[PDB]
Amino acid sequence: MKRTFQPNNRKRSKVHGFRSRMSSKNGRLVLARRRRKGRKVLSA
Amino acid sequence: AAAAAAA
Amino acid sequence: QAKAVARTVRIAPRKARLVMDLIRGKQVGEAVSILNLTPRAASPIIEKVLKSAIANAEHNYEMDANNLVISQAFVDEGPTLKRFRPRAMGRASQINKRTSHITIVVSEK
Amino acid sequence: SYRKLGRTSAQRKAMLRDLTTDLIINERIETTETRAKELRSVVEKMITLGKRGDLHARRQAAAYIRNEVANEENNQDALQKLFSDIATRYEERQGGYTRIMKLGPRRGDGAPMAIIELV
Amino acid sequence: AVPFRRTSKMKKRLRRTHFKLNVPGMTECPSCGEMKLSHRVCKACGSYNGKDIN
RNA sequence: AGAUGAUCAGGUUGAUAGGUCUGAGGUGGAAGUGUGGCGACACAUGGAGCUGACAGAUACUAAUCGAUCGAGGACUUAAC
RNA sequence: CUCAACGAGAGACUCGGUGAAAUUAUAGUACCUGUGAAGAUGCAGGUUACCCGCGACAGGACGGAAAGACCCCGUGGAGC
RNA sequence: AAUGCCGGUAUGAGUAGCGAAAGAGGGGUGAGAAUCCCCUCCACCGAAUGCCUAAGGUUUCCUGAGGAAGGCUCGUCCGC
RNA sequence: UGAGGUGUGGGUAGGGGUGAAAUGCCAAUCGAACCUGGAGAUAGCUGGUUCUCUCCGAAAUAGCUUUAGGGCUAGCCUCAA
RNA sequence: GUGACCGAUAGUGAACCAGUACCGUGAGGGAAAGGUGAAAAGCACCCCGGAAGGGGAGUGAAAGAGAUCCUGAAACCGUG
RNA sequence: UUAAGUUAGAAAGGGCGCACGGUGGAUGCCUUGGCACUAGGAGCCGAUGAAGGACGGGACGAACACCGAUAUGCUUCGGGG
């Protein structure tokens, strides 16, 4: 049937992208926790 | 009740 | 006595024992012809080990191969390759790719 | 009772026609043993149809022989081959136009193979 | 349809008594050998009583 | 006879299976040719043609050559 | 259905290749009548039973799968 | 001895399964062919099982070698 | 042919949204989504608790208790003076 | 610079291309995996095999030391 | 030779013991890394563009580290041969 994940790169970059998270202090804290753990991929 | 309806 | 070991070729050991239990103790002249006609497709591998043992007897010791007889015909198990087969409703059952050590020892009678 | 050979009856008829015609051109084919046993009676029946040589027997044989070329650079069909070569070759012999010779088992499935030839 | 107890080694070996397979009906080929299973054409020489028919 | 084993009929001084021939039964009047009709069609050749496992004949084909298993018969007591 | 009988295909059966899973205290794991935590393959008395498999059925192993959902308790919780 | 955690290995067991739906034969390569290549029949879809073009994947496309592991078998073949 | 299906781009976020109203749905999750922290919450409840030998050896009773399968004090046990 | 601190299921999640592989749309969750020999001196050469893998012959103190490679237990599988 | 008795051996396969192996990484040694601290220092970096990354740069195939189209680097001042 139609499953949950229907991929679209524009929607992914609009919702979970770098500029979406840099536009609020919430996503800035998300990126700070991402850098503090040392993950290679910071955002979508 | 004791209904055998195990899933 | 000459010895040849297969050492990690891809065949399950239980299927190799079904040929090795009957090939054991026979003369080598009546042993290749058993392997040619069985057919039981581990038997070409057992044939390769048997010809390797006969050639090791002929070249390294000169044991006059027409007089040879099979002495030791044990089958051991090698390392198992682990594979997973998907099933219904997300079960992920395990599949064992078995591996055997085929060893044939020939000597005089 | 005849064999079913694991096929549908239409598939049985098509495979038997294919094997009969292919035996009729190539004169020696290698199949399984039970296919050989089912094929030999049909092949000798079609040779018996070729023995008569009349138009009605040829039209009976045309309903079974498939349209494949028998002899190259001669434009001979298989149906012409039955009534030109095989019938004249087996004019004296009364039955037994084929023999089956068994081979060893097959590698891929353990199938006992057989050689079929027109004799 | 669920095994109540596991099978022991001895019961498993007793069940595997008849799992062995027999020696084929192999005989001397009159042309070359060796050897040839009965009622089949020899794979070595391709002969059968006694013409080379391949 | 039968899931497979097994059982039964048989393996070239022989009818075990297939083919061939002749039959039983089934279906119903084959193809081609000719006649009548503008034609669809009908009639004659002709109980025709065809026919899977049902019979009887016939070694034409396959059951080849071969190989394996298989006993030298314990001791007492009564007559021999 | 009375009342079921055939036929076709796929699986099941045989062979060749590959090859899991639930479960599992150990197990050389009969029946009857009793006894027992009050419903016994394992206890007592008796009755039967050469060893090992293959194809089937599902009466038992209070079978397996889910720390019963019913009922009760918790000076547990959640929604109204 | 926690329906403990992790790792290894058994039982079930050479058992279930090997995932809709047509293949057959003759040549070729090769150590090895029911599965690879060629040819001839036969079969299937055909308001598609045809053509292209998004989203998506991103090298999966072509050629030459190769076959360890992955092709639920094999493999000389492949989206390896 | 319509209170129609569907594509793309968007909006409403959990004591909230949305609901032709079922306690339905909100990423296989819903009488209150998921993740991380308080947090090793708490559990009068169930399970578990790892070497040996010797000496002595119980109780399942009374009272009280939002107490009845929990607790406290007496009764019974052990060691020392 | 020091431990009546740990020694590869321990000690940082991470002694090793580790916040990596992998899972999730996302926030986030999050592994497993050390050891030849002192020195590669890593088995020239011969035979079987298509190769892998063996048996000789060599290097080495040890080749049962030969690429998850020091020692190598038990479950498990085998042969007498 | 008969009749009646009494015994051994029988193994398709199996059980126990012993011998020889395979699988596996427990144990024993063993650190290349960690955990606590001590005595001192250092406690900020950035529009003269930070922290952190993407993309690249080696004759040579991918990655770690290093570096930035002056790219596996470039000067000056010392150490060292």
Q: Report the distance separating Cα D80 and Cα D84, nearest Å.
A: 6
Technique used by the depositors = cryo-EM
b/e per residue D45-80 (b: at least 16 CB within 10 A): ebbebbbeeeeebbeebeebbeeeebeeeeeebbbe
Tell me the three-class secondary structure of chain C, residue by residue. Answer: CEEEECCCECCCHHHHHHHHHHHCCCEHHHCHHHHHCCCCCCHHHHHHHHHHHHHHHHHHCCCCHHHEEEEECCEEECCCEEEEECCCCCCCEEEEECCEEEEEEEEEC
Helix H or strand E encompassing D96: none
Resolution of this entry in Å?
3.0
Separation in Å, CA of E33 to nearest CA in chain C: 9
**Counted domains in chain A:** 1
Residue D108 at interface with chain C, using a CB cutoff of 8 Å: no
Measuring alpha carbon to C1', the residue closest to nucleotide H40 is D68
D66 touches strand H (CB under 7 A): yes
The residue whose two tokens read 């297969």 is C6
- Phi, psi for D91 (deg, rounded to 5): -70, -40
A8 touches strand I (CB under 7 A): yes
Q: How far is it between the farthest Cα atoms of chain E?
A: 62
> Is there a contact between E32 and E42 (Cβ–Cβ < 8 Å)?
yes
Q: What angle do CA D101, D102, D107 make, to 5 degrees?
A: 145
C76 touches strand K (CB under 7 A): yes
Cβ-based interface (< 8 Å): residues of C facing E? 18, 21-22, 29-30, 33-34, 36-38, 40
C77 touches strand K (CB under 7 A): yes
Helix H or strand E encompassing D10: helix D9-26
- Domain map (residue ranges) of chain C: 1-109
Instruction: Name the pairing type of β-strands D76-77 and D98-105.
Output: unpaired
Most C CBs within 10 A among E34, E38, E42, E43, hence the mutation to make, goes to E34
Range of the domain at A13: 1-44
Burial class (CB in 10 A: 0-12, 13-18, 19+), E18: exposed
Contact between chains at D104 and E43 (C-beta distance less than 8 A): yes
Q: Report the distance separating Cα C63 and Cα C60, nearest Å.
A: 9
Most C CBs within 10 A among E15, E16, E18, E23, hence the mutation to make, goes to E23
Q: Report the distance separating Cα E40 and Cα D114, nearest Å.
A: 9
Burial class (CB in 10 A: 0-12, 13-18, 19+), E41: buried
Closest alpha carbon within chain D to E46 = D103
